[PDB]
Amino acid sequence: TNKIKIGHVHMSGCTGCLVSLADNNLGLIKILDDYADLVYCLTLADVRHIPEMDVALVEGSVCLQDHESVEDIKETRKKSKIVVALGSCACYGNITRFSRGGQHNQPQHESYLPIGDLIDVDVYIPGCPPSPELIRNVAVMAYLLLEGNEEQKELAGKYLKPLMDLAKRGTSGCFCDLMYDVINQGLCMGCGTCAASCPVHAITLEFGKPQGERDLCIKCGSCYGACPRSFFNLDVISEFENISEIIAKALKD
Amino acid sequence: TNKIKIGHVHMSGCTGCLVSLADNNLGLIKILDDYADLVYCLTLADVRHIPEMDVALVEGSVCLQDHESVEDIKETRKKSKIVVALGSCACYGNITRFSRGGQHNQPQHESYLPIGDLIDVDVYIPGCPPSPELIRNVAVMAYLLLEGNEEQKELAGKYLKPLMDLAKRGTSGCFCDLMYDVINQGLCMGCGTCAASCPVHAITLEFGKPQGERDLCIKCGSCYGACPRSFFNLDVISEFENISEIIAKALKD
Amino acid sequence: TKVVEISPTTRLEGHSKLTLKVNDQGIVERGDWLSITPVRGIEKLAIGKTMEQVPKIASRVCGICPIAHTLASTEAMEASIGCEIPTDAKLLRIILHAANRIHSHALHNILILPDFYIPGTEKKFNLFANEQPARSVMARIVRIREIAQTIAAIAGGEAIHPSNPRIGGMYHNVSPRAKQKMADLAKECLVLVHEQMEFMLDVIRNMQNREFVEVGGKQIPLPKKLGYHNQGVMATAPMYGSSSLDDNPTWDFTRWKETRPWDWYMGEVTIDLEDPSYPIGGTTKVGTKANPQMESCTGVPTYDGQPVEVGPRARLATFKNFDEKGTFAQHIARQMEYPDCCYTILNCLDNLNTSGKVLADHIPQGDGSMGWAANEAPRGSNIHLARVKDGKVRWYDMLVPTTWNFPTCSRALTGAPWQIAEMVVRAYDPCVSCATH
Amino acid sequence: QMESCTGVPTYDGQPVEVGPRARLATFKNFDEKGTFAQHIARQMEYPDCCYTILNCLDNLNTSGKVLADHIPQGDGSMGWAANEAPRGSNIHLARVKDGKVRWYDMLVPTTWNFPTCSRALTGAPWQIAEMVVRAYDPCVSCATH
Amino acid sequence: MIEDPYLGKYVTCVSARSTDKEILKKAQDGGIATALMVYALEEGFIDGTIVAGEGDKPWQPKPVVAMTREDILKARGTRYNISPQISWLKEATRSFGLDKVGVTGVCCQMQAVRKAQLYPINMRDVPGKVAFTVGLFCMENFSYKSLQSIVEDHANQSLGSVKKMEITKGKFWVYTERGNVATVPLKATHKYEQPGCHVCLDYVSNLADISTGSVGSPDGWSTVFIRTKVGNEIWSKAVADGMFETKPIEEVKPGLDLLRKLAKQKIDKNQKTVEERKTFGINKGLRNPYA
Amino acid sequence: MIEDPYLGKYVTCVSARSTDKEILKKAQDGGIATALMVYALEEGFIDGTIVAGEGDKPWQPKPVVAMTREDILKARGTRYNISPQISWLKEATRSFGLDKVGVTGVCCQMQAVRKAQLYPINMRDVPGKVAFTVGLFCMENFSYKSLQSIVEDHANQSLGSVKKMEITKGKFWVYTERGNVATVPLKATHKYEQPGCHVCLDYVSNLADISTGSVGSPDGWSTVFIRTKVGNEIWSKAVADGMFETKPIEEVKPGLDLLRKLAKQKIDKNQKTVEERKTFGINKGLRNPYA
Ligand SMILES: Cc1cc2nc3c(=O)[nH]c(=O)nc-3n(C[C@H](O)[C@H](O)[C@H](O)COP(=O)(O)OP(=O)(O)OC[C@H]3O[C@@H](n4cnc5c(N)ncnc54)[C@H](O)[C@@H]3O)c2cc1C
Ligand SMILES: Cc1cc2nc3c(=O)[nH]c(=O)nc-3n(C[C@H](O)[C@H](O)[C@H](O)COP(=O)(O)OP(=O)(O)OC[C@H]3O[C@@H](n4cnc5c(N)ncnc54)[C@H](O)[C@@H]3O)c2cc1C
Ligand code: NFU
Ligand code: NFU
Ligand code: SF4
Ligand code: SF4
Ligand code: SF4
Ligand code: SF4
Ligand code: SF4
Ligand code: SF4
Ligand code: SF4
Ligand code: SF4
Ligand SMILES: [Fe+3]
Ligand SMILES: [Fe+3]
């Protein structure tokens, strides 16, 4: 089989998503060596225009008043088999939800939307910053989905399904996810995972129940993602020891 | 024509919605005199069980762990031609989004949802408290929809359409509506109406743009409702002088 | 003994039921009145939230008395952090408070009159009906409530869930024009509430002279001591309230303890008496199991180890040694509170400086100290207790009037024919969403 | 003028260079300039980072307090803080009152370096203009914020 | 009642200017917006009104509830950046105790009031207490940073020296107190416009009781539309009381011909924008508040 | 590898108790959860572990990262209310500087760890640093107010006097320090259970490395499942090192027969609940996290 073709597309992002990918260290070099060709990434390489990609890792949101940005995100959908919203800005808007214009030297750059409001998104990788391990798992599994035996492609499709469901669920992320869709649904069981995942310490547990500092929350969508009562896909997660060994072998020298 | 039949159904509400209806003063008495029979309202009358209604004004959200409540809201859909989510608790959950159980003497009463997550809702009247004038307009227009000439029923259907669209849009309400669906959409024009409608002073304008104190916001959905860039139905609103005179004549002695 | 149950109660705020053991004559031997309103849980969800947010959430406990929770919650925060608000903020809060008491007592007139008789006749008031004298009474009540809500909106920012109160005082003083408008309305209201008060007292006196009332076509005897209980009363002020900031607070937190319904309510019973003719829809089906200890949704606050009565009669008994008890005495005491509301508003307006400061210059953030504030809500003593630290609520507790009155009214049911148990209940002007919060 | 997305901070009325060479020039009178001098100064900063960490760890008391006992809420006074980010002086200025930000301003290293690097382009063959740029280690998301 | 497809519904259109010489000293145009509100206050049609007062930075407006003639006059002259007039709409009926609220503002602010009157959403008491609205013509608006950039850079003027600003004859004009004049071609200002203005389908404040603006009238004069029954009662009385000089608009150059054409260009250009929102993405679009 | 449809995947199941007499003095059952974590620490399989320590109210647990034998032993005994163990999972790898994190908790907490290992969502460094999980059996849990209500009302005991609590033989048991015993029928406790427990489809901590509990074993003993390669390496070494007495489970009464039956009742009852969520409303349902 061939290596799949992967691009990193940079919209209104901070490059922390790219840094997260790079923080797989020799893992990334192993993937680039054996499974994937980086065909486009302005930060790392000199390909100036968006080429065709099997997988586009798209970070950042879209500024509606920046013509080239709107064209880039449409061109990306047109050029890509699989579009991945990489990180919470691409998935959910994140800190650019708060953008409201008025700053030099483009006071009209006022409106930012997650990429899923402008194009169809196949896969979400939520997180701010996203976990290096997640970006790696998704790249490996995308390779298996495209180049593996049908036993692998079956595993890969089952692994990615909840990240594809997230992309179909919507383009909003907030502390309030845990109210709306977990506590208010009768699904919260007080494990406290949301509090560990929150990057800004906006979540405490009081008598076993989430308490959200909404004016600290930066709307990244991490806590609903990590909650074991958002998606819990038993067919994958109960096979954790096996899937771990499979991923590890794919990275071994 | 006959009077339509109207009930007030009380879920997990505060009765401030009923008080708002009553604060139409001689307006309400005029409606009860000439256009509608109150067939059910535990606060005001002794009918113990939910009867058939043309219009059910339903206030409050639904506690999922209270069996009689769940039965009441299903029985209400079954018994009613038109279901109106009256007030922000019924529309959007409002302060019961924050409910998380643990208090005597029912620590398991943990999960509350707006009624639209359990039954289909025809019409939203958002607000906490809802404006007496809005509840009155909706009752009058519902009467015209059911008992008027086809010129009236056409007006009534056009008046109610944006309140029916709100019920189809979703069951969430928050300061963040103005980010998600107005500022982030390129529709905000700095009029400041959201700041006037907010019942808890959580909204300021900074250089002409909304600034939200999310840890003061009680998630009532008022500000998106009142914003002239949520729904602006030109066919109705440009006829304001006419529709005003029509409503007033329907209340005149 | 048989067991009959009315569920739901009507012509009161919110969702409760009456689970009653009756003797061979149908007289209550031991009855439980209990909340079955779901516990929204305001005290627990408050933990970690800002001291600015919690009072505005607590307001949404109840839309009839939101003034009571807005002020008691805010003043509990102010008491915990040691914040002294400006004079003109206090005056505006008192105007807001008195206005709301008018609207609430007048609303309760609407709820109770269908049980009462046009004096000297056998016709009961039907306030829906477009006939005299009901319609002229409705017109007066309706103008009274309109005035009251208007004053509340001007001084408090909103009639339902007032927006003007904040930690440290108020967002806004009022204009010279608004001050004149509130005075003009209070002058009008004072004449009206004097008329409504005399009307209601006449109607109640006629009730006290009746031997029976009609329920579902049957004659129900009226006991002389209807609604009597031996729990005594509790009150913190004749009008406004008290807080732990005061030199001599008028409420004693060492005398309070809150139990579960467990200590005071009956256990499991089975309904074996049913009346399908009870207006309108009958009583609970024979064979239904009930368990007040477990179904009751409230806690039970006590004072000196016992339930107490709160509300207008409690206030008049505490502060003027009013010496009548029971159902009609409760009704009387409530109407008698009408004029104080209007004189208080006018006196407060006379002292209000519309240029005066309404926000304390310094708002401390709290060190975890406990403070408390009592507001004399229309239904009785509403006590909020709080520990604020670094601007966050670390501990919160609410002892709401109808919470206090639930076990006390239950005990007052003894001796009533079960078919007018609901009349005993309504003299407490119940707010079951308040009691549960 | 119209497409540029940044503001232009100046010092004594002129653009300035910030970053590793600026730090070595200011604090040791490092006296080489231009593209390769910028590259040199950046590499020379590697060891200070590790000696500093080790010295800080040596002085760190793992039982010691890490939060001030009192956090005032502010009266609207202006304060500022400079951090020597990897690309140069990062200056944030703020007025806090009652725990809220009433005024905020950010002068970020690449913001400062944008007009200065532009001027350094004179004399370069246009095909290595990008090499002149890269010696500034640009962070354009920083410069724009 | 004329029902014009670009100038909205109105009873008459005249060219007018106030006879109050104090008002005219600092009015942008004819002094219609100030004269109408002062007169409404002194006659008792309103007991207060929302006007764009002076704010905390030069040429930045601050909404305020004015209740005296003197406070109304402080709001004279056009501020070409955002003034969130409607933020005081409910409060005017609360702590201010007004029974008869006036509102001044531009077309979208008139729309906000009419939406509040028909669909009050946490706007109790507002429908019945709005007594009088005067709407300004408005082609587009700017953030304050936009306005600083235009005046300080493009016109090279100090904001603290500016006496008047004016968009007319294809140029953004700046007049200084010491007597100088600078202009900027409107083409240069386009990047700075507030983006939410680009879906606006309303030029001459179609929904106001009385609408007033500059285009169609000579300098020092205003083009005025009298639209509603409220608007006609007040205007008739004011004219009868000597408050205004008038000229029928069709005797005035360039008049309604130019004005109707500028209204058409605004609506057509912005209706196109509204249309392009629908297919803005790939197989996705942006929201249309008018849908 | 047995693959049981109600007891999950495991290599063996024995009945066991620690040989450490100090540990057993206050262990709930066999002292397996404490003995396994102490041994793992002293052998270096972990450098710290998340345990349910003592909190600020009597019998309210507080999660804590324990790094000494003494801190692990403070977590002995069952607290039948919620302890949000996973809230310290990431922090254990940050300010604590751990390379080999242990986690103790009930079945849903084991699930949380495995989800974090496979789908780290703002859980950087956690997948590779989880070194050892010990899962407790769990039929259901309670809020703290629920637990107060059960102990103080139904059992009539003061929380400050309680030495041990135990759900067994159809009753909630309370043991006091001065030697008294009170019981409550489990039927009385049902209203108090945490509602989110009612969709739980996991009884014997299926996803842990080693699972341990009481049912199936005599008093003072634990039923233990050794499940993963991590779990088998540590258990083998510990047994070889003298840390545990064991008995094959099938030589023990009531053993795996009763246990598999209680697991089946839990899953069947909660699977039904999960099914009813789907049609909970009229033409609408509630969310299924398992869908
Ligand atoms: C952004 C803006 C764009 C405009 N575009 C046009 C145009 O294209 N064509 C045209 O003929 N006229 C336009 N106008 C109107 C014109 O500039 C004058 O404001 C109008 O003729 C009223 O002048 P006057 O002499 O009657 O009012 P004056 O007596 O000088 O009183 C000024 C009035 O304008 C209001 N006002 C001033 N600034 C604002 C503001 N930022 N926001 C809301 N209300 C304000 C004040 O409250 C007051 O009521 C615009 C006005 C504004 C604010
Ligand atoms: C809510 C709950 C329900 C349970 N239901 C059953 C059951 O139905 N059947 C059965 O056989 N066993 C059940 N158990 C397990 C049993 O009660 C013992 O905890 C188990 O046998 C381990 O005991 P031990 O002697 O090995 O541990 P010990 O050495 O006494 O150590 C106690 C361990 O339990 C952990 N722990 C204690 N309380 C909690 C808590 N609230 N939350 C998370 N972790 C905690 C501690 O961190 C520590 O690791 C339940 C435990 C809990 C917390
Ligand atoms: N009055 C009153 Fe409320 Ni609706 C009660 N009970 C409380 O504070
Ligand atoms: N170094 C650096 Fe940043 Ni990405 C820049 N420029 C700033 O502070
Ligand atoms: S998701 Fe976070 S790390 Fe990724 S581009 Fe957005 S701000 Fe940066
Ligand atoms: S991670 Fe999910 S189930 Fe666990 S405490 Fe947070 S919201 Fe509740
Ligand atoms: S609470 Fe924390 S994890 Fe959840 S969306 Fe907000 S910032 Fe992200
Ligand atoms: S919407 Fe507001 S006023 Fe209506 S029931 Fe809910 S808390 Fe009460
Ligand atoms: S009401 Fe709407 S358009 Fe007006 S300022 Fe608020 S968000 Fe922007
Ligand atoms: S910001 Fe104010 S109006 Fe908007 S949802 Fe929150 S509380 Fe309601
Ligand atoms: S162009 Fe329209 S949206 Fe913009 S300020 Fe003028 S009237 Fe408002
Ligand atoms: S029954 Fe399940 S959800 Fe509830 S505490 Fe036990 S393992 Fe967690
Ligand atoms: Fe309470
Ligand atoms: Fe800056």
Numbering used by the authors:
A (entry chain G), B (entry chain G): 18 to 270
C (entry chain A): 2 to 438
D (entry chain A): 294 to 438
E (entry chain B), F (entry chain B): 1 to 291
Manuscript text:
Here, we employ a bidirectional F420‐reducing [NiFe] hydrogenase from the archaeon Methanosarcina barkeri MS (MbFRH) as a unique model system to yield structural and spectroscopic insights into a scarcely explored reaction intermediate that is the initial target for H2 binding to the active site of the enzyme. Each asymmetric unit contains three subunits, FRH‐A, FRH‐B, and FRH‐G, and a total of four [4Fe4S] clusters as well as a flavin adenine dinucleotide (FAD) cofactor and the [NiFe] active site (detailed below). The FAD and the heterobimetallic [NiFe] center enable the redox conversion of the two substrates, coenzyme F420 and H2, respectively, while the [4Fe4S] clusters mediate intramolecular electron transfer (ET) between the two reaction sites. These features are shared with the related [NiFe] hydrogenase from Methanothermobacter marburgensis (Mm), and both enzymes exhibit a dodecameric overall architecture in a spherical shape.2 Compared to the latter enzyme, however, MbFRH contains two additional cofactors that are both ET‐accessible and solvent‐exposed: a [2Fe2S] cluster bridging two FRH‐G subunits and a mononuclear Fe site in FRH‐A.
While the presence or absence of bridging oxygen ligands can be clearly established from crystal‐structure analyses, H2‐derived (hydride) ligands are only observable in sub‐atomic‐resolution structures, and available crystal structures lacking detectable bridging ligands most likely represent hydride species.9e, 13 Since crystals of MbFRH have been prepared in a mildly reducing atmosphere containing up to 5 % H2, the derived structural data could reflect Nia‐S or a hydride species. IR spectra of MbFRH crystals reveal CO and CN stretching bands at 1945 and 2065/2080 cm−1, respectively, which resemble the IR fingerprint of the Nia‐S state of several [NiFe] hydrogenases.6a In particular, these vibrational frequencies are close to those observed for the as‐isolated regulatory hydrogenase from Ralstonia eutropha (ReRH), which is a spectroscopically valuable yet structurally unexplored reference system for the Nia‐S state. Specifically, a peculiar seesaw‐shaped geometry with trans S−Ni−S angles approaching 120° and 180° was postulated to be mandatory for thermodynamically favorable binding of H2 to Nia‐S.16 In line with this proposal, the [NiFe] active site of MbFRH exhibits trans S−Ni−S angles of 107° and 171°, thereby structurally confirming this unusual geometry of the Nia‐S state. Notably, four‐coordinate NiII sites, as found in Nia‐S, typically exhibit (distorted) square‐planar or tetrahedral coordination geometries. This indicates that the atypical seesaw geometry of this [NiFe] intermediate is dictated by the four‐cysteinate coordination pattern and the protein matrix of [NiFe] hydrogenases.
